[PDB]
Amino acid sequence: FLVHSSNNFGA
Amino acid sequence: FLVHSSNNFGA
Amino acid sequence: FLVHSSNNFGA
Amino acid sequence: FLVHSSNNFGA
Amino acid sequence: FLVHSSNNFGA
Amino acid sequence: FLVHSSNNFGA
Amino acid sequence: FLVHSSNNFGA
Amino acid sequence: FLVHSSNNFGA
Amino acid sequence: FLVHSSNNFGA
Amino acid sequence: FLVHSSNNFGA
Amino acid sequence: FLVHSSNNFGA
Amino acid sequence: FLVHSSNNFGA
Amino acid sequence: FLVHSSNNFGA
Amino acid sequence: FLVHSSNNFGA
Amino acid sequence: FLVHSSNNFGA
Amino acid sequence: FLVHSSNNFGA
Amino acid sequence: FLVHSSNNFGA
Amino acid sequence: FLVHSSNNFGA
């Protein structure tokens, strides 16, 4: 199994 | 301007 | 599964 | 001018 | 599923 | 002049 | 489904 | 700009 | 078996 | 920039 | 058998 | 930069 | 039999 | 740099 | 029979 | 540098 | 029979 | 450098 998370933010 | 964000997680 | 969210704002 | 925004989430 | 919302305003 | 706006949501 | 609203005003 | 991050683990 | 984790962050 | 790390163990 | 571990970190 | 380490044992 | 261990570290 | 060590014994 | 051991260390 | 040693005995 | 032992050390 | 020694006996 793989647990994963990603996030991003921009302007 | 243009502000944006995203989040995700999975398994 | 993937849980995900996105947002944006502009002018 | 033109202001706009959006949000979403899913799974 | 996707829950989503959008808005805009202008003049 | 011309002012306008809209909103929506769905799933 | 989509719930939506729009408005405008001018002169 | 653009900020981003991710994490994961597995076995 | 392998247990593993990774992370990253940037801008 | 870009920061990253990882860990693992196994047998 | 082999038990093993590894780690790294960078920027 | 890049820092790294590892350990193992066996028989 | 052989029992053995190894380690390393760097940057 | 790179530091390393190992040990073993057997019969 | 032979009992034996070895070790090393470096940088 | 490189340091090393070994021991053994037998019969 | 022979009983024997050896050792060494270096750098 | 290199230091070494050995011993044995038999019959």
UniProtKB/Swiss-Prot annotation, chains A, B, C, D, E, F, G, H, I, J, K, L, M, N, O, P, Q, R:
Subcellular localization is given as: Secreted
What function does the entry list? Answer: Amylin/IAPP is a glucoregulatory peptide hormone that plays an important role in the regulation of energy homeostasis. Selectively inhibits insulin-stimulated glucose utilization and glycogen deposition in muscle, while not affecting adipocyte glucose metabolism. IAPP function is mediated by the CALCR-RAMPs (AMYRs) receptor complexes. Amylin can also bind CALCR receptor in the absence of RAMPs, although it is more selective for AMYRs.
Question: Which residues of the complete protein does this chain represent?
Answer: 48 to 58 of 89
Record text on subunit structure and interactions: Can form homodimers. Interacts with IDE and INS. Interaction with INS inhibits homodimerization and fibril formation.
Name of this chain's protein? Islet amyloid polypeptide
Post-translational modification, as annotated: Amyloid fibrils are degraded by insulin-degrading enzyme IDE.
Q: What else is noted?
A: IAPP is the peptide subunit of amyloid found in pancreatic islets of type 2 diabetic patients and in insulinomas.
Family, similarity comment: Belongs to the calcitonin family.
Swiss-Prot/TrEMBL domain comment: The mature protein is largely unstructured in the absence of a cognate ligand, and has a strong tendency to form fibrillar aggregates. Homodimerization may be the first step of amyloid formation.
